Each structure stands twice: as structure tokens, then as C-alpha cells.
Amino acid sequence: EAGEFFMRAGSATVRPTEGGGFSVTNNTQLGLTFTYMATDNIGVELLAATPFRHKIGTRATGDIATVHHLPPTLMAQWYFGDASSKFRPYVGAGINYTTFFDNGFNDHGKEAGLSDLSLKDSWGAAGQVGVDYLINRDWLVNMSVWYMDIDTTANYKLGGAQQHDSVRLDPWVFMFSAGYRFH
Numbered sequence: 613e614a615g616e617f618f619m620r621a622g623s624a625t626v627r628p629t630e631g632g633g634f635s636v637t638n639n640t641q642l643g644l645t646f647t648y649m650a651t652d653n654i655g656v657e658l659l660a661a662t663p664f665r666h667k668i669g670t671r672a673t674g675d676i677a678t679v680h681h682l683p684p685t686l687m688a689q690w691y692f693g694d695a696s697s698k699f700r701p702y703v704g705a706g707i708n709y710t711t712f713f714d715n716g717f718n719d720h721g722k723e724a725g726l727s728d729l730s731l732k733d734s735w736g737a738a739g740q741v742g743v744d745y746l747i748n749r750d751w752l753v754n755m756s757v758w759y760m761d762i763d764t765t766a767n768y769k770l771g772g773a774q775q776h777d778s779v780r781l782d783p784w785v786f787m788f789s790a791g792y793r794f795h
């Protein structure tokens with residue numbers, strides 16, 4: 613597999629970790645991954661996706677603002693078994709980068725006096741465990757479980773300027789996908 617380059621396309625579901633309430637909704641997007649096989653086990657993977665849309669809310673108010681973000685992640689991977697194996701599970705470690713954007717309070721949020729919402733970027737440790745089933749020499753199916761440190765702060769104006777709340781997304785990411793190989 614050394615020298616190989618493959619791409620996976622599939623769904624990438626993001627399940628944040630418990631951010632009244634103040635909770636963040638789950639969300640699935642088109643997840644694409646680009647991996648380069650350093651040497652039959654070591655590979656470099658890049659995770660990309662369509663922009664994620666999340667909702668924020670108190671069980672008292674219901675949704676009150678919606679958020680968007682790109683969580684690109686770079687990872688060093690270890691593929692168990694040899695090139696010849698057709699069932700190659702793997703573990704990976706790397707760094708994450710999330711960029712929030714196009715964030716805003718609902719009408720109801722506004723009603724409650726919320727305004728001007730924005731979130732600062734994030735960087736963090738990231739790890740994964742997943743398996744690639746190599747059907748043909750050109751195709752594979754795949755599952756993957758990621759975990760990323762995605763801590764960030766929200767700045768808004770509740771009536772005046774109570775704009776400082778930390779948000780700990782620390783999401784678990786699941787990805788079911790198929791992939792094509794370019795030797």
C-alpha cells in the first residue's frame with residue numbers, strides 16, 4: 613500500500629458533548645477523507661466535510677440560535693495487518709481545526725433579547741479508531757469513530773453584553789463510507 617492514495621466519501625455525523633440547559637444539536641454531513649499511505653501501515657489522513665449546521669437551546673426556550681462549522685482534521689494513522697490484509701482496522705492521532713460561521717439567534721432568541729453571536733475558532737487533539745474493508749484492489753467500505761477537542765467561546769448580547777460563554781463541543785464523530793483507491 614506504500615505510495616497509495618485513497619479517498620472515502622460517506623456520512624459524517626457529529627455528536628457534541630453536553631455543552632437551564634444550553635445544548636447543541638447533532639448533525640450529519642458529507643464527509644470526505646484523503647489518505648496517503650506512508651508505508652503499509654502509516655498513513656496521513658485529512659478529514660473534510662460539507663458545513664455542519666447545529667442548533668442551540670434551553671429546554672425552556674427551545675432552539676434559540678443556529679451555528680455552522682468546518683471541522684477539518686489531520687491525522688497520523690497506523691493500519692493493522694499488512695497490505696495483503698483485506699480487513700485493516702486502524703488507530704489515528706492528529707490535530708483538529710474548527711471554524712465557526714454564519715451563526716445567529718432565532719426570532720425567539722431575539723425576542724428573549726439575544727443578539728450579535730459569534731464564535732472563536734478552535735484547535736485540538738483528535739483521535740480515531742476505524743476499519744477499512746478492502747473489497748477489490750480499488751474499492752473499500754469503511755466505518756470510523758473520531759473524538760475531537762473542540763472547545764470554543766460564544767459572544768453575544770443579551771440585552772446588553774452578557775457575551776461570554778465557553779462552549780465545549782468535544783464531539784464524537786461517526787463516519788460510514790465507501791472509498792476508491794488510486795495506485
Ligand SMILES: CCCCCCCCOCCOCCOCCOCCO
Nearest residue numbers: 621622623642644660661662788789790
Ligand atoms: C472539501 C469539501 C467537500 C465539499 C465539496 C464537494 C466535493 C465534491 O464531491 C465529491 C464527491 O462526493 C460525493 C458522493 O456521495 C457520497 C458517497 O456515498 C457514500 C457511501 O455510503
Ligand SMILES: CCCCCCCCOCCOCCOCCOCCO
Nearest residue numbers: 622623624625639640641786788789790
Ligand atoms: C450505500 C449507500 C448508503 C449511503 C450512506 C449515507 C448514509 C445514509 O444517510 C444517513 C442520513 O443521516 C442521518 C442519520 O443519523 C446518523 C446515524 O448514522 C446513520 C447511517 O448508518
Ligand SMILES: CCCCCCCCOCCOCCOCCOCCO
Nearest residue numbers: 654688689690704705706707735736737
Ligand atoms: C506513526 C504512528 C501513528 C500513530 C500516531 C501516534 C502518534 C503520536 O501522537 C501524535 C499526537 O499528535 C497530536 C497533538 O495534540 C494537538 C496539539 O495542540 C495543537 C495546537 O494548539
Ligand SMILES: CCCCCCCCOCCOCCOCCOCCO
Nearest residue numbers: 698699701742743744745746747753755
Ligand atoms: C454502544 C456501542 C456500540 C457497539 C458497536 C459495536 C460495533 C463493533 O464493530 C463492528 C464491526 O463490524 C464488523 C464487520 O462485518 C463482518 C465481516 O466483514 C464483512 C465483509 O464481507
Ligand SMILES: CCCCCCCCOCCOCCOCCOCCO
Nearest residue numbers: 745746747748752753754755786787788
Ligand atoms: C463484496 C461486498 C462486501 C461489502 C461488505 C459489506 C459490509 C457492510 O457492513 C456490514 C456492517 O454493517 C452493520 C451495522 O449497522 C450499521 C452501523 O451502526 C450505526 C450507528 O452507530
Ligand SMILES: CCCCCCCCCCCC[N+](C)(C)[O-]
Nearest residue numbers: 636668670677679724766770779
Ligand atoms: C455552539 C454554541 C453556540 C452558543 C450559542 C450561545 C447561546 C447563549 C445562550 C443564551 C441564553 C439565553 N437565555 C437568557 C434566554 O436563557
